[PDB]
Design a protein around this nucleic acid. Structure first.
Lengths: 38, 113, 139, 243, 192
RNA sequence: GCUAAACCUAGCCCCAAACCCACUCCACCUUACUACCAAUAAAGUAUAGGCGAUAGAAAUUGGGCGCAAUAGAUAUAGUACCGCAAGGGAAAGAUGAAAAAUACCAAGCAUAAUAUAGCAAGGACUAACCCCUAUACCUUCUGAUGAAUUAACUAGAAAUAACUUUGCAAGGAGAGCCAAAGCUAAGACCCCCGAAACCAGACGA
RNA sequence: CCUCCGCAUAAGCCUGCGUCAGAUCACUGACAAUUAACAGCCCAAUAUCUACAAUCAACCAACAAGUCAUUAUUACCCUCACUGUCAACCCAAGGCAUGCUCAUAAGGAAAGGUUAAAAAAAGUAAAAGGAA
RNA sequence: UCUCUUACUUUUAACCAGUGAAAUUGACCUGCCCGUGAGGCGGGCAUAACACAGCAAGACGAGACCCUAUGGAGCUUUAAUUUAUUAAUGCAAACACCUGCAUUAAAAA
RNA sequence: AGUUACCCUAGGG
């Protein structure tokens, strides 16, 4: 377990870095997840 | 606590004082400048395609050489509009459910009384 | 002040002044033994050490010699009926050492029934030698 | 449930909603037009009706335009009404063979022209067909101000058009300074395509570009309530004076 | 407080209320007939006549109103009996307890006829709105000192108008009156 | 008599109508929530097609015989929980006017362990047993498979022709369609669970 | 009587045997706490300097050929802010980076009570022989 | 190790006390011999009921191998025909790059 | 067209 690693791969910045990650966040926002990212 | 009501009374008094001073400040601002809000802002459209009220921050350098600011995306690419439509439909569903439930409740009320 | 934007400072600019401070403070009894000149406060998260010094010196005319701060973590180990964690908020503790050899000790704060009580002396408890027979009857 | 409006009508609904509604009427019309670009990569039928050799009866025939893919490089250059044909073929022109993907690309020529009205040497990537419509239109100028938007299918073409139409509308003396007779000769040479300046301002604008222009146009500093109230007080004093 | 929360005799926050309505109960909601705020006509201190149940025909006074359930508690009427102060070994003391009555089971009473009558809310020149009886043109009025302390502002000081309306901010008035001088001028920054 | 049972109403579903949302202050693309720097009909017709499986025009014409807590939304909540992540994804509540009034019914057991012998019964019998008779069931073979038990849930969807029953009748039909007794209308025929794969786009390694 | 463990830091976790009160081989509510010197959190530009290992670095001894640095001019005067600091703890159902101690000054408990059957597991001892 | 096993200790075990699973389970009032096709059928025989501890003969409980599917997937080629492409050439166009049309191979279906 | 001791799935003996 590592916080640096976790925030590097699944974090908000990494998600928004690409259109695929933006789509992940959009999917999770449509579903209503409390946690959209790490 | 000996008398907890006076805490609420003090809090209400201070909220009233803040309201009064704020009213004076905004009246003066409307008079001198015509602006309605103290903090400058804009209507922008973030990466997820939603309209937001972006509140501005104070900076030393202008925006075109602000490295961090220019990383933010105030526009949506065409892959968002499908998700915008699906969110619209989700909101529509919630509203339809609510309005129908209100009508059913009214029917029940009229049935009983 | 809390929950406000601060005007940005630039070289040779006017002093930042706050006219109606927004953060409020309490002085709480220490949970452990402390030196005589130490006063303990619970303080908002945004309030700094310099802010607390100036706050006490200005509003309360208290000559402050040292200030130390720590952030206390509130417990997240308690749950609703829905197994959802309930947060006790975190807070800031300040330790203020007073100046000029002054001393502080926390003061000793906190140093319809008539008929109920008047019938409480009218039990007329059950007599053992009666053996369950109601005592109301005059026979 | 159901939407009140079909989804394909949502763009048209949006055009009537906000800042799009405040745009000039002629520009919104230009956006509304849907007329068909001239055939380029397919041969149109001669007539609406035709007798087939199979059953000998007359049926109506329609020409279904072959889709053309315009890569973004085309918007920098000036191709004809022509672009890429992303299609499929049969292996040896026999339907009993495999179906395999083909792309038909044009031949791009880096030619160099002179816009007389704008008085500039432009290096442009074109096609042989572009040179043909150039020859038939008798000049880059006439070609640009004649060929409609769908037939031009180029953003650079519409930038040239907008510049040209503005230069006509403005009667701009900056074409040829200290040379009025040639300026007048060129300006009369294209009297046909003279347009009002307001109309020329919005020609060839993409919708986002038009919204940006409009939002600049109506961006005004909010007038302080002080002078509104002063004017109101002055007006009230005038009314009281006449009483 | 949760939705469909059940209003009762105990106040919505009391100890008895938290016991009766813990944060996890979901009971069947009570159907309360919607009476508008300007259609309500039973107030605390009102004399009322009881129509239904025990104590029918007896007149009393409205002690509490629970408007979330169209409830009127007529003091000393509609009464059962309960024990209070029930300890381990003491049975407690019996006492009369009131149960709420719906507004339909209660009528208002004229101050001179002393009979139950319907009421309408009529406008008056003197008072913009007030109750009136139906059996007669009689108005029914609405029913129901102090020492200043060490930290209570006197009315004389409270109401005094010290405000001169001007075109200066509190910051500026306070700086001018407090004699705080600032020669340094703000260097404008970029907002975006 | 224990365990338990029972309960209606939260809400939801399908329509109709109507085109929706989105700045208290503050914070949030950096390790997010971080003050601040380079219709209908034409018609299943024409047509297309390993001319076959199939595909198929145009001209032209013009509130509830809904669910009611294993149901109905997944929804008490996209929560708890699971997963590094994308992602997956629950369960459940019931008094009354007032709580400022605290019986009778599944299985499983208990009251109440058992007595030669045997699909556990049937014929009986004065009589429980003793006597006589009796190769569990379902599926698949021509004649091994599954199941502790209780409660709930759980599986046949198409009217061309024909037939029956009506209406009207050389005509029927509320355009189009059919007609050498036909035509119009109705009725009545076509299940559930259970691969490897392939493709597209993400997420991790 | 055991100690192949311990004590700190890192990483991870996040208040998870502190006080008061209650219920439950014999967790809940409330209150309280970790205080910077340790450690994070740095650096004004424009050019321009940075050939010779470590190994006690002295020989020797080599190859795989190495872990390290400034100058010139210009600008510069305000100072001790913010954050981590708790535990019996993490990851899985045994593993764990670094320093210090190498049996402890630190840290723990193999036996719920009895009996002394079989079978089973581990250990010890075993005549004569010593791979049958 | 064995001829050839024996003694002791600990754990386990058995009993007492506390806490307290799982696979399994058509129902069972669950015997032996012989025969038929075996606790249950036929013929003999036996047979009051009831634990606890054992044993492991029977009852009851994976790992392979073959075949089939007009069921898949991969690998190799001199299966089918093709070169979408990539590398080359030849020919058109233009005044070498880019394009269009054919041919030859590798890697491909 | 061969092949799979990497084979895989539904069934059968």
């Amino acid at each position: 377990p590592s916080n640096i690693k976790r925030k590097n791969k699944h974090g908000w910045v990494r998600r928004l870095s690409t259109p695929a990650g933006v789509q992940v966040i959009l999917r999770r926002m449509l579903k209503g997840r409390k946690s959209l990212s790490h | 606590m000996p008398s907890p009501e006076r805490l609420d009374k003090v809090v209400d008094s201070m909220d009233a004082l803040d309201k009064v001073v704020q009213e004076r400040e905004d009246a003066l601002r409307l008079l001198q400048t015509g602006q309605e809000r103290a903090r400058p802002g804009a209507w922008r459209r973030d990466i997820f395609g939603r309209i937001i009220w972006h509140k501005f921050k104070q900076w030393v350098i202008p925006w075109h050489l602000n490295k961090r600011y220019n990383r933010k995306r105030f526009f949506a690419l065409p892959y968002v509009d499908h998700f915008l439509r699906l969110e619209r439909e989700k909101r529509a569903r919630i509203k339809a459910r609510k309005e129908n439930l209100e009508r059913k409740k009214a029917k029940i009320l009229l049935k009983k009384f | 002040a809390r929950n406000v934007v601060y005007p940005l400072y630039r070289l040779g600019g006017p002093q930042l002044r706050v006219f109606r401070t927004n953060f409020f403070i309490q002085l709480v009894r220490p949970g452990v033994a402390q030196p005589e000149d130490t006063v303990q406060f619970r303080i908002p998260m945004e309030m700094t050490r310099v802010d607390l010094r100036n706050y006490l010196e200005g509003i309360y005319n208290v000559p402050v010699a040292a200030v130390r701060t720590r952030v206390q973590h509130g417990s997240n180990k308690r749950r609703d009926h829905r197994n959802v964690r309930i947060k006790k908020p975190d807070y800031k503790v300040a330790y203020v050492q007073l100046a000029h050899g002054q001393t502080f000790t926390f003061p000793d704060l906190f140093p319809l029934y008539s008929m109920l009580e008047e019938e409480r002396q009218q039990r007329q408890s059950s007599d053992p030698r009666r053996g369950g027979v109601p005592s109301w009857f005059g026979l | 449930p159901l939407h009140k409006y079909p989804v394909w009508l949502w763009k048209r609904l949006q055009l009537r909603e906000g800042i799009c509604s405040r745009l000039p009427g002629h520009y919104l019309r230009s956006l509304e037009e849907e007329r068909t670009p001239t055939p380029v990569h397919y041969r149109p039928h001669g007539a609406k009706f035709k007798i087939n050799p199979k059953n000998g009866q007359r049926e109506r025939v329609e020409d279904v335009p072959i889709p053309i893919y315009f890569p973004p490089e085309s918007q920098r250059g000036l191709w004809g009404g022509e672009g890429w044909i992303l299609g499929q073929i049969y292996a040896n022109n026999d339907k009993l063979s495999k179906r395999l993907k083909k792309v038909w690309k044009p031949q791009l020529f880096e030619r160099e022209f002179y816009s007389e009205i704008l008085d500039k040497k432009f290096t442009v990537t074109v096609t042989m067909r572009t040179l043909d419509l150039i020859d038939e239109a008798y000049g880059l100028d006439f070609y640009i101000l004649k060929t409609p938007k769908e037939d031009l299918c180029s953003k650079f073409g519409m930038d040239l058009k907008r510049g040209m139409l503005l230069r006509l509308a403005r009667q701009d003396p900056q074409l040829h300074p200290e040379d009025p007779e040639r300026r007048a000769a060129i300006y009369d040479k294209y009297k046909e395509f003279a347009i009002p300046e307001e109309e020329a301002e919005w020609v060839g604008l993409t919708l986002e570009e038009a919204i940006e222009k409009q939002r600049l146009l109506e961006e005004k500093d909010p007038v302080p309530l002080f002078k509104i109230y002063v004017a109101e007080l002055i007006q009230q004093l005038q009314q009281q004076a006449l009483s | 407080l949760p939705p469909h929360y059940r209003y009762g005799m105990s106040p919505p926050g009391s100890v008895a209320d938290k016991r009766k309505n813990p944060p996890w109960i979901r009971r069947r909601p009570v159907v309360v007939e919607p009476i508008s705020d300007e259609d309500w006509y039973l107030f605390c201190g009102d004399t009322v006549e009881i129509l239904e149940g025990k104590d029918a025909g007896k007149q009393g006074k409205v002690v509490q109103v629970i408007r979330q359930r169209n409830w009127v508690v007529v003091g000393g009427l509609n009464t059962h009996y309960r024990y209070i102060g029930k300890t381990m070994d003491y049975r407690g003391t019996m006492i009369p307890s009131e149960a709420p009555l719906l507004h339909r089971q209660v009528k208002l009473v004229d101050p001179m006829d002393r009979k139950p009558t319907e009421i309408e809310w009529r406008f008056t020149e003197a008072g913009e709105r007030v109750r009136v009886s139906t059996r007669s043109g009689r108005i029914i009025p609405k029913p129901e000192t102090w020492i200043d302390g060490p930290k209570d502002t006197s009315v004389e000081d409270a109401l005094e108008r010290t405000y001169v309306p001007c075109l200066k901010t509190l910051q500026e008035e306070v700086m001018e009156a407090m004699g705080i001088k600032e020669t340094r001028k703000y260097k404008k920054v970029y907002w975006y």
